[PDB]
Each structure stands twice: as structure tokens, then as C-alpha cells.
Amino acid sequence: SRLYKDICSLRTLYGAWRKVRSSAFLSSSDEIRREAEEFESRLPDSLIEIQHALSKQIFIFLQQTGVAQKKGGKSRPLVLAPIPNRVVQRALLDVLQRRVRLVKRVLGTPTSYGGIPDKRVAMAIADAREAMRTGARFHIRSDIPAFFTKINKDRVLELLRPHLNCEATLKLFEEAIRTDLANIDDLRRKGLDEIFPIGIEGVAQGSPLSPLLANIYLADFDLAMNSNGITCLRYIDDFLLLGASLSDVDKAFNRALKELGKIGLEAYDPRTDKTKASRGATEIGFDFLGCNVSPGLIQPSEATRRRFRAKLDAEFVAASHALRYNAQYQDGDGKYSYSSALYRIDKIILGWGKAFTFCNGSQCMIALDDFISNKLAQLEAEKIAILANSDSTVRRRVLGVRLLIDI
Amino acid sequence: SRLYKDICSLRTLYGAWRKVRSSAFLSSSDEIRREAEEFESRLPDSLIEIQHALSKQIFIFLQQTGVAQKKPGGKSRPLVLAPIPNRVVQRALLDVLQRRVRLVKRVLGTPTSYGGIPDKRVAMAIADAREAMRTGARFHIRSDIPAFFTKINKDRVLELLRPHLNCEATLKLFEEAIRTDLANIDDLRRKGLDEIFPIGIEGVAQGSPLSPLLANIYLADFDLAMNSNGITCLRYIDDFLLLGASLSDVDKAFNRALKELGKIGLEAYDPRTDKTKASRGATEIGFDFLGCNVSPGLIQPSEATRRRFRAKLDAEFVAASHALRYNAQYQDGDGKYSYSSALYRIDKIILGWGKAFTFCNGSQCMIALDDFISNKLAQLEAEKIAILANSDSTVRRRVLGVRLLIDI
DNA sequence: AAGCGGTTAACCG
DNA sequence: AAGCGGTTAACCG
Ligand SMILES: Nc1ccn([C@H]2C[C@H](O)[C@@H](COP(=O)(O)OP(=O)(O)OP(=O)(O)O)O2)c(=O)n1
Ligand SMILES: Nc1ccn([C@H]2C[C@H](O)[C@@H](COP(=O)(O)OP(=O)(O)OP(=O)(O)O)O2)c(=O)n1
Ligand SMILES: [Mn+2]
Ligand SMILES: [Mn+2]
């Protein structure tokens, strides 16, 4: 089977591993990094082993580890797997997306944008604002509660059996999407087992296949909803319905509830969940994918700016505490030294402002820059007060220039 | 042959490629890493091509590029930049020669040799020297070989390793790897820089992984001869220390060293004529070795090493002051030299340097260097307070180094 | 247009 | 103790 042969090819497996290591080497978890160093060493052989197993069809997905990601909703069920699992999983995604028509068709879908190669949030935001200015005068925006968890692996499998034409790739794909948690007993003891995809409901959050799986799951939804003069733009779970009449979108959301109902999914009702979903005249402006889409103006959603000001606020108080602490105290992290804090704050402004460069949030950005400018001025004066009466050593640990005598 | 089989191992080759990739991917050179990313793409095939060729013995080293590199003094480092396949096969050769060749493992093994050897550091040599002093070595001569890589003779190196390798194919690969062929030779000849590069049998390429091992193999006869008759010779690459009970014993040793070096075509800086490259005198008073000042009681960074550090730090502060003035009036700033970014980098320079001399015990000069830092620092604050007193918010953000969202 | 062997950003050849 | 897809470090799911 040429499809299966691609999966066992060393070009694919090394391509996949390149993708996996790019993450592992940066992992906060030392074990993941070191497991990757152990895989990077013996690299020709460490992938040939997998290639060998895959070829003789005796590859074994190792038991995973289910952890709880700090989360509004229930702690995200993060399924962390060994490197060979992640490598074989990333391999499957690469071969599926270049060789399977249904996959490329699902990637092709014009109204789907999340987790699709060559597709970005900005493109959706553009299409949305294009629908207004073509007769979109009202909206509903909603998302699927616990989407992955409610995804059914039996429906996933049944949709994929036709377009696979390789019973071996079917077995591999089947084992790829199972979750066998090795810490299951500890997880039962905390009463946490039930949120993980240990049964047929759910896909592993943390597998590379799951976003494709999700997008395949809503293939039917995407088609049904783009009809009746109602335009639906979906990024992952989030869907924006755009229409001429409030009545029209209201009915469409009702059709959506039935459409997601067939496949086990609900959708936050805008009137019921104003903080999770939205409804109204597209003119008032609406929040979508972190932007506020007004037809005159487009900018990051207030919540995104709020988050950003809160992260900035935290850093600045962190610095102030440190400036007093470093004076009169020998030990400091030095992360919060004036030099380090400003350096972090500068790169935070870079990283965030870099993603919103498409947005024109200038009235808001100037306020965010006004917030930063004021915060910067305060700390500067705060430190000069302390520096005004300070010996060289104190200023050194305050400013963040290490002392050689203490190394 | 097991030796050659080893070199044609894709695990051997990939190991070599990993080390080459780590260097090329951080390379300042536009050309060099572009070449490396392309090799990382197509990686599976990129290396089998080399493996096929190595197994077939059809492998061809490609033409290299010679670069005279400005060095302190009028001296130039003859850089030989090679294509990625050259570089991979050469690191492959090094990795195999150092794990399978008995002579090679013995040369790395020698106790008195420390440069470019795995599991070996400058401190281990400084420690060995102090012990020799503790057991009665009260006088020393320290010297260096001029242009050592340039004067090594490939034919002697081949003669030394030919009995040990036991494979004609390994020997042929080694000869091709040692050899230098330059694409840029006509341009160098017009320059007059052609002679510096190892185009001839004399010399070993700088920028080749093999060349540091070759030098250790070349000086192995010197290492045994020097460590005799009450004299301990400790060598890191070219640099050598002769340790003895009496000045006469060290003086006699230097003459012996020149003779051992002379047979192999090498020479040493004279301790009386050149203060910078050789020293002579009593170990009880201090002497410099490998950037350390080795006193029987105290070890510290050497005075030259501290001057470099003081200059590197001074440069950083000069740049910071200039940018302080520039980032106020203009917007074309580099930002690397903004107050926040400047102070942050200086801190990490101070980290890395103090980390290098943790094996030293002298605090007096560390304290004086700390004082100099605090002086330049407080000056820079004076310069920042001044500029910012007459400043709007936009200038304050450009000076301090907290970029504006508007300018993204 | 910037390379190599090595060490706990840096250091030594 | 920390994962995934996608995009010009971050953002969005
Ligand atoms: N860091 C990650 C990783 C994966 N996903 C995936 C899994 C979710 O099922 C899907 C939908 O995105 P949501 O943020 O809406 O996630 P949930 O549907 O789980 O949350 P909620 O119940 O709050 O809608 O996106 C995600 O959102 N965020
Ligand atoms: N950055 C460096 C420093 C040194 N070396 C190698 C090649 C040199 O020939 C050898 C000896 O180091 P020296 O610094 O003593 O250099 P030279 O012997 O070439 O010059 P000099 O006459 O100044 O001693 O170490 C190197 O490859 N790269
Ligand atoms: Mn959701
Ligand atoms: Mn020299």
C-alpha cells in the first residue's frame, strides 16, 4: 500500500520527528526534553526501530499520561504520550494531509479556518467582514462545549473507513486515537478519570491528529450551515453565523443545535451564555476569534486587551516588589531586576503586538501604550528614589547587573 | 574493515551532522546556514548520498574557501571554510578515529596533554601544575609554538597514523580530508595571501575538526621527551610549561624542547625576547598559564585576561551611552543597545565570565573588576537620568528600551 | 563575510 | 510538574 509505505518511509518519520523534537527540546518538562535528547542520540536507529515496527505492523503505542491543564471549563485533559507515539502520530497526519482526498477536501473547506494549513485567524476575520458588505446584518457567534471530549471515535472511524483503502493504515489510525493512561488508578483516586477519552467518546487533546479529527467531525456541520442565505465561518469549535435578519440567524442557530445534536455536540446559547456566545446586529460590532469586528474598525477583543494589560500589570508590580526587595536583600531571582523586567516587558509587548499588527486598534493600542508609558515612568521614579541613597552593591542587584564577587 | 564500516554508519554520519548543524545554525554567515538548512531539508537522502559514496569509495571532498582573518598583531588566522559534506565526513573521521584507534586513544590519554581532548579542561592542567610545584618545582619556563598549524607536515602525520589505521581506504579518506584545495586561490594569489593557507604538504587546515587531534599526535614525541629528568611539561595545544627544581634545569629543558620541536620543524617563542608568548622564573612568585596566574597560594584570571574583560565591558558601556543619546533623538535604534537591553546583556557577560573562573580563589581582582563595573554603571544611570529629565513618553520608551505597540 | 577541538553566555588554544 | 493544529516569540482554537 503506497499510503502505508509513505508512513514507514524514513523521510516521513524523520520529517515527523523534526516536528516533534522542535517542541520537545523546548519543553518545560525536563523529562520530555531528555527523552528527546535520548531519541536525537541514536537518531538514525531510533527512527529505524519505529520504521521496522511499522513495516512488520507490530508497532506498539506506549501508555500515555493524562494530566489536568489549568483551565472556565474543566481542567483541560492533556494526554501526554511517549516520543514514538507522537512521532508515529505526526507521521500519520503528514501522510493523511497529502494523500487522502477526504482530508484535503476537509482542509479545502472554504468556511473552515482553524488548524488548517495555509489558513489563519485573519483570513476568517476578513471573510466575516466581507459577508457584512454583502448582506450580513446580524450574527450569532457560539462555540461547542468540551468539543474534543464529545467527539465520538466510532463516528470518526466510520467516516474514515471508506477513504483509507488500506486495512493496515486503518489499524494504525485506530491505535493512534486510543488513549491508554498509565496513571489511570491515581486518576480514579482523585475522581478525574471520567474527563479523559479512555472510552470511545473523546480524542486525545495533545495528539496531532485531533484537530484534523475535529475538522472532519464537522464536515457535515460546515456544509449544512452554509445554506439559506446564512454564512457560517468556523475555526475549530467556534462558529460565526452571519445573516440579513435577526430572525434568519436565530433560526440558523436553532438548525445548528439540531445539526450538532446528531453528532453529540451542543453550542453555548448567546442569550443564555452572553459571556460564551453572542447575538445581535452585526453593526453594534461583535467579538470573534479574539477580534472586535466592526465594519469601520477592527481591533483585538476587549478581553484580549484586558488579558494583555493584566499580564503587563503583574510584571510591573513584580518589578516594584523586587526593586525594594533587592535593596536590603542579598538574594533575588534577578528575573525581576529593573533590567530583566523591562527586557521581559519589552519582549512581551513584542510578542503580543506582533499578532495584532493586522488589527487597527490604534485608539485602544494608544491606551495600552499609554498604560505602559505611565507604568514605565512610575517604576523609573520609584527606583531613582531607592538609588538616590544606595551603595554600589545595592544598585547592582537592583538594576540587575550581577556582582562578580558572588558567583 | 571494521574501521571503515564505522565511518559509513548512518549513526556515525548523523552524529557528525548533528555537531556540524549546531555550529552552522548559529553561524553569522548568511551563506553558511542557508547551506545547512538545505542539507537539513532532504536530510534522509542528504546523508545516504554521502554514505553511498563513502561505501563506494567514490566520495569527493569539494573545493574549500580560504579566508585570511584579521587577528591581534599583524598575524592572520588562515580560515578554510569547507562545504557541508566535507565538514560532515571530517567530523565522522574524528569520531571514529577517537573511539577505535589505539594510538589515537593513547594521544588523548596522555596526562600532560590537555587541549582539544575530550573530558579535559584548563583547570585540570592548572591543578597538575600546582601539585608539581607542591612537590618541589620552584622554577618554570612557559612557551608557545609560532604558527603551529601552518608548520605541521601532513606527510609526518600520515607516516605516524599509517601503521595504526590498518585500512587502505581509511588512509585514503584521511589523506583527502587533511588536503586543502582552494576555489579562491587565484584571488588569494593576487592578494599575496596564498602562501599562508596549507595548499602545500606543509600545514593543516584551520576550521577542520581533525586538525587539533593531528597536532596532539604530532607533539606526542615531544610530550614523552619533555617529561623526563625531573622536568614536567604540561601542554595545551602548542602552549607548554616546563616545571623544575632549579632555573638551570628549566633552561636546559627549553634547549631540549627546541631540539625536539626542531626535528619536527617547529620553534618556540624565547622567554627572554618575548614577554607576551613565553615566561621564565621562580614559581613561588606568580606566573601566567592558559589565562591564569598560577601562584603557589593563589590562582586568579591573568592580567591580560582581565584587560580583555575590562575592554569588552567598556565597549558595552560606551555603546550604551551612545545609544542613550541616539535613541532619544532618532527612531532607527538597534535596540540591542537600549538601556534595558544593554544592562541585561552586560549582566550575562558578567555571568559567563565569572562562570569560567570558578576554579580560582583570588577575590581582590574580582573586587576591583566589580568596582569598575559599578563605576561605569552609575555613570550610565547619570547619563540616563539626564536625557530622560528632558523627555516625553516616546523618548522615555525609546531610551529605556520598552518598545511601543504603535511602532510594530 | 565567521572555522575547529574542548570545558563548568563565557573560557582555553 | 506543560501537550496539539495552524499562522507571521505570540496569537487563535
Ligand atoms: N490549548 C488548546 C488545545 C486544544 N484545544 C481544542 C480542544 C477543544 O475541545 C477545542 C475547542 O476549543 P475550546 O477552547 O472551546 O475548548 P473546549 O471546547 O474544550 O472548551 P469549552 O467547553 O469551554 O468550550 O480546541 C483548545 O481549545 N485549546
Ligand atoms: N581560535 C583558535 C585558536 C587557536 N587555534 C589553533 C590553530 C593555531 O595554530 C594553534 C595554536 O594557537 P595559537 O593561538 O598559539 O596560534 P599560532 O601558533 O598559530 O600563533 P602564534 O605565533 O601567535 O603563537 O591553535 C584554532 O584553530 N583556533
Ligand atoms: Mn469549545
Ligand atoms: Mn602559537
Numbering used by the authors:
A (entry chain B): 2 to 72, 74 to 409
B (entry chain A): 2 to 409
Original authors' sentences:
Bacteria encode a variety of reverse transcriptases (RTs) that evolved from mobile group II intron RTs to perform different cellular functions. In a previous study, we showed via genetic and biochemical analyses that a Pseudomonas aeruginosa group II intron–like (G2L4) RT functions in DSBR via MMEJ both in its native host and when transferred into Escherichia coli. Here, we determined a 2.6-Å crystal structure of a full-length G2L4 RT apoenzyme and a 2.8-Å cocrystal structure of G2L4 RT bound in an active conformation to a snapback DNA synthesis substrate and incoming dNTP. All RTs share a common structural framework composed of fingers, palm, and thumb or thumb surrogate regions that fold into a hand-like structure, forming a cleft containing an RT active site composed of three conserved aspartate residues that bind catalytic Mg2+ ions.
